[PDB]
Amino acid sequence: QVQLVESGGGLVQPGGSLRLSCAASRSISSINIMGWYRQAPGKERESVASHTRDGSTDYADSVKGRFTISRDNAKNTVYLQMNSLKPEDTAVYYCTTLTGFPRIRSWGQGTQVTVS
């Protein structure tokens, strides 16, 4: 599988911004899907954003316009730029990849984001 190391995160004021980063232990250019999930307290974990090799992206409705997922092939890193943050964005965020046949899903450690 892929070892995924997240960084960034922490506390931010409402309407502020934060950038999460997730570094992969292998070349991301051959990783089909990279993405972010999150689990807010009391809720089930949900997909936030995903990004394929050719740049196709999808987003949870509640973050469209505010979040942007992107890749940096030189650093083997996927990013989640989160602007205009709201208290409902408070959650543990999880980096993830899905690639190969068999389709193997890998997970980062989880990063707390607090908007208050």
Added chain:
Amino acid sequence: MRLPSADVYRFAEPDSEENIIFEEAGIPIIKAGTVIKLIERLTYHMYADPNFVRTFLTTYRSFCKPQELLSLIIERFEIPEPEPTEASAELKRFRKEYIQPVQLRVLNVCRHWVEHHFYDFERDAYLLQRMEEFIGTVRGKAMKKWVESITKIIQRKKIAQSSPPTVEWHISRPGHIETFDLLTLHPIEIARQLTLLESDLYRAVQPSELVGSVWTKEDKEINSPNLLKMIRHTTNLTLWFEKCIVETENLEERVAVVSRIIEILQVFQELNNFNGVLEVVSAMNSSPVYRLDHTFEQIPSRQKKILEEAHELSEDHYKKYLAKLRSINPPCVPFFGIYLTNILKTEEGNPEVLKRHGKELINFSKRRKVAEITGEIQQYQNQPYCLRVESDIKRFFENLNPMGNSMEKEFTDYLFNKSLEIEPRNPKPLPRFPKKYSYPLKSPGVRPS
């Protein structure tokens, strides 16, 4: 060791590091030179160099036009009188030791040109006219032998084991062109006819269509027509697979579509059509298809296995594919895209010219590197399949046009957002969709009759 003055015959200029460089000893390996020096060594008075003629005629269009090359070899051929000492023996020696060898080697270049690159003259009838007129001016018993062999090649070029298995049919009937489709043709026969088609397209690519990135440039339709046909077939077929999948909104029908494509893959493998194998692998890894969890969940384990084994051919820079391609026996269709990737890497990692003392030299070693890649392609271009063409099925696959008039960017966005419709993102539930096929989804399998 007489010579005409370099002022009246350009090829007599002394060798220097500013006009010719060799690789770092009997016949030197050319690394770079001015075009004039390359042509001099192409037609050198001291020896023949078939390997250099071979590489030069494959790659020269990346630094010289065909009509320009003909002008230069005419200039090479028409040697003036040598510059005179203040004072015949030295004269006669010049004609025997310089003029005759050089002029013979010029005619050998012309012969190799029509023997192995006659498409230059098919694309440009006036180039052929100039060549016929030039060799018509040649005089002498020894050289008319070469004129004769050139003329015979031109004339022939202007003019131009066991039983195959039974063609397989499923729901579509022979002659029922309007019923042909992914699920209605027999998956064996889809794989056979696509293999015949791709075998033909692969065999038609000339090495020079691959030199100097000429297929991404302005005259690409004239300079790389067979290469472009290959690439566009691979695009259209891969996108057609993706389109068949995501435009099938009903889950059970879409599982049948994906299963059938894996069966076609299995037959590609049995036929050693690695080109087709990797087209399927590309479709399954694509943005619209790869994310379809609910569809891959229903694929039977034996077919998951076939797809996994095909996919592993591509891992680690195609290590297992390159191993399998060495070890199979003909006929085969090699995966073509890997050669384009390796050529583009070579084209990008080497400069077009080298500089010595401010003077520019054509980087010929770069052309040789690309030519070596195109040579490996050629080693697989004479492997016909013992399979019968079905003219209607062949035409069906020749005419695939999934994008219609749209461009690949809008079309791929169309496919990807369609994927999001049929299998919404992970919090959202899975809707049910109506069937679109009225015929049975059950495959006839891939065992021949």
